Write an enzyme that holds these catalytic residues in place. Structure first.
Site, PDB file in Angstrom:
ATOM      1  N   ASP A 176     -11.322  -4.927  11.608  1.00 33.30           N
ATOM      2  CA  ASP A 176     -10.947  -5.466  10.292  1.00 33.30           C
ATOM      3  C   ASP A 176      -9.438  -5.684  10.177  1.00 33.30           C
ATOM      4  O   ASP A 176      -8.828  -5.319   9.180  1.00 33.30           O
ATOM      5  CB  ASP A 176     -11.498  -4.588   9.179  1.00 33.30           C
ATOM      6  CG  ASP A 176     -11.600  -5.230   7.803  1.00 33.30           C
ATOM      7  OD1 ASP A 176     -11.671  -6.476   7.719  1.00 33.30           O
ATOM      8  OD2 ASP A 176     -11.555  -4.502   6.826  1.00 33.30           O
ATOM      9  N   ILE A 199       0.887   3.224  -6.563  1.00 36.35           N
ATOM     10  CA  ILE A 199       1.133   2.123  -5.618  1.00 36.35           C
ATOM     11  C   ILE A 199       0.057   1.058  -5.857  1.00 36.35           C
ATOM     12  O   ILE A 199       0.382  -0.065  -6.188  1.00 36.35           O
ATOM     13  CB  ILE A 199       1.140   2.581  -4.118  1.00 36.35           C
ATOM     14  CG1 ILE A 199       2.376   3.442  -3.812  1.00 36.35           C
ATOM     15  CG2 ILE A 199       1.095   1.359  -3.152  1.00 36.35           C
ATOM     16  CD1 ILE A 199       2.433   4.040  -2.377  1.00 36.35           C
TER      17      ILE A 199
HETATM   18  C1  LIG Z   1      -0.648   4.408   3.768  1.00 33.63           C
HETATM   19  C2  LIG Z   1       0.391   3.637   3.001  1.00 33.63           C
HETATM   20  C3  LIG Z   1       0.067   2.698   2.045  1.00 33.63           C
HETATM   21  N1  LIG Z   1       0.966   1.994   1.343  1.00 33.63           N
HETATM   22  C4  LIG Z   1       2.254   2.259   1.633  1.00 33.63           C
HETATM   23  N2  LIG Z   1       3.236   1.582   0.947  1.00 33.63           N
HETATM   24  C5  LIG Z   1       3.113   0.469   0.171  1.00 33.63           C
HETATM   25  C6  LIG Z   1       2.263  -0.640   0.304  1.00 33.63           C
HETATM   26  N3  LIG Z   1       2.461  -1.535  -0.648  1.00 33.63           N
HETATM   27  N4  LIG Z   1       3.452  -1.023  -1.413  1.00 33.63           N
HETATM   28  C7  LIG Z   1       3.925  -1.767  -2.576  1.00 33.63           C
HETATM   29  C8  LIG Z   1       3.848   0.157  -0.936  1.00 33.63           C
HETATM   30  C9  LIG Z   1       4.930   0.948  -1.586  1.00 33.63           C
HETATM   31  N5  LIG Z   1       2.700   3.166   2.518  1.00 33.63           N
HETATM   32  C10 LIG Z   1       1.750   3.832   3.181  1.00 33.63           C
END
Ligand SMILES: Cc1cnc(Nc2cnn(C)c2C)nc1
EC number: 2.7.11.24
Length: 344
Positions: A142, A24
């Protein structure tokens, strides 16, 4: 047999429960991935934390773990699982397992125009989440678009409690230009003048900045350095009134403000000509110079702009209110706090 999963030349060792990983993103001390949870049969988010080398990473990790495990609210990200070694000696990384969201507001704002109904709903859910946080006597400290996660149907969850503190309004005072940790563009004017950021008004300022950025897709006060941040705020709000200067007793701070030329207020509706007038009335009340006059969370929720959603009976509060520790005691504390997720 088998071996641990790898993402981009990094152990991301979450199996056998969590498989089929996708990168991610990351931060300063963690890679973030999605993974298929073989028990719940859903894809999840997993954040890899390796904080046992710096004591500020340990403080921040522990603070957030404790807060997110205590908190339970639809607009605040939870922890679903925590992966770590069975002993302190073998524990090097911690993995935090959370609901998988589609995106965050920072990414959404760089690519997407928000309708007024989206802005309204997002602001509602921020404040609803913030009411709960503040009711527990906690400050987020924040709030910014990258700490607001969105799912595919635009439900919002607040994340990142690493800078959070218990509120301490009687120890809020400090001198002029006191160094601060939280993200510059969302820092209230008082931080640069006379405040440690120990009052609930600090988060409302950040929400005001986020509201402004939802209106235009551009941060409202993009300061390039510590005191520049105050230049940008005063550029739009104009020079503080005599009454507001009278609350700033510290002389260095007061005399800095008296040294500046007169600046006129920039009307909100000039800055944001397509915004709803009620959104700009609430914006004005959140971006008030004087933190004592600044609107509180529960008043912000009751504001006309949010009348389609406002329902105090469906905006819950916490059941109850929520240092100098070395790396070894903090590691022991993190091990202890993550024990409930272990097999046995
Ligand atoms: C704790 C947490 C962090 N990120 C996400 N998703 C996320 C954020 N940005 N992208 C592209 C994605 C897929 N879901 C949960």
């Amino acid at each position: 047999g088998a071996g641990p999963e790898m993402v981009r030349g990094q152990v991301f060792d979450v199996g056998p429960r969590y498989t089929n990983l996708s990168y991610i993103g990351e931060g300063a001390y963690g890679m973030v991935c999605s993974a298929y949870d073989n028990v719940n049969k859903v894809r999840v988010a997993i954040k890899k934390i390796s904080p046992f080398e710096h004591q500020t990473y340990c403080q921040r990790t522990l603070r957030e773990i404790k807060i997110l495990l205590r908190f339970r609210h639809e607009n605040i990200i939870g922890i679903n699982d925590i992966i770590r070694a069975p002993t302190i000696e073998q524990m090097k990384d911690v993995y935090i397992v959370q609901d998988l969201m589609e995106t965050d507001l920072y990414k959404l704002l760089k690519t997407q125009h928000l309708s007024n109904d989206h802005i309204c709903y997002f602001l509602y859910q921020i404040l609803r989440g913030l009411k709960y946080i503040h009711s527990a006597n906690v400050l987020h400290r924040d709030l910014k678009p990258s700490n607001l996660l969105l799912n595919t149907t635009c439900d919002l969850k607040i994340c990142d409690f690493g800078l959070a503190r218990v509120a301490d309004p009687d120890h809020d005072h400090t001198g002029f230009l006191t160094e601060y940790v939280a993200t510059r563009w969302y820092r209230a004017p008082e931080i640069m003048l006379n405040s440690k950021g120990y009052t609930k008004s600090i988060d409302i300022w950040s929400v005001g900045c986020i509201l402004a950025e939802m209106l235009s897709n551009r941060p409202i006060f993009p300061g390039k350095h510590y005191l520049d941040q105050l230049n940008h705020i005063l550029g739009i709000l104009g020079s503080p009134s005599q009454e507001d200067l009278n609350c700033i007793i510290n002389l260095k701070a007061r005399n800095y403000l008296l040294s500046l030329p007169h600046k006129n207020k920039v009307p909100w509706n000039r800055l944001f000509p397509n915004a709803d007038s009620k959104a700009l009335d609430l914006l004005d009340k959140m971006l008030t110079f004087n933190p004592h006059k600044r609107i509180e969370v529960e008043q912000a929720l009751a504001h006309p702009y949010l009348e389609q959603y406002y329902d105090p009976s469906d905006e819950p509060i916490a059941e109850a209110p929520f240092d100098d520790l070395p790396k070894e005691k903090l590691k022991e504390l993190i091990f202890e706090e993550t024990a409930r997720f272990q097999p046995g």
